[PDB]
Write a protein that binds this ligand. Sequence first.
Ligand SMILES: [Cl-]
Length: 129
Amino acid sequence: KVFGRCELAAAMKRHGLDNYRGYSLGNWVCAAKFESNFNTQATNRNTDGSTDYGILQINSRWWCNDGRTPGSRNLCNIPCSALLSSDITASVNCAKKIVSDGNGMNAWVAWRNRCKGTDVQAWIRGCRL
Ligand SMILES: [Cl-]
């Protein structure tokens, strides 16, 4: 599924991401835009044999099991295939674990480089929440 901006904002708000662990909703929408272009089926392979899955590009070395990543820890206790659903619940529930692990939203490279330090509230402007 490819979400619209406000559609994704509303879905993320319903699943409890607004202000979760200190991160306002616009952070999460900005991260999804630059990680996956709002596409629930995005995947990207990495040089360590891991793959990033879904709308928030969750990595198979640490967080989900894809059966093909050496050294996997599966800390979200979910198959990576669940993260390619058009329903974002499993991705959001795993993202909540990732942001609580330690280093906040710094797990998302595109957030760190392209969202942090900007006015991220602009990402939810004009949306009916
Ligand atoms: Cl899988």
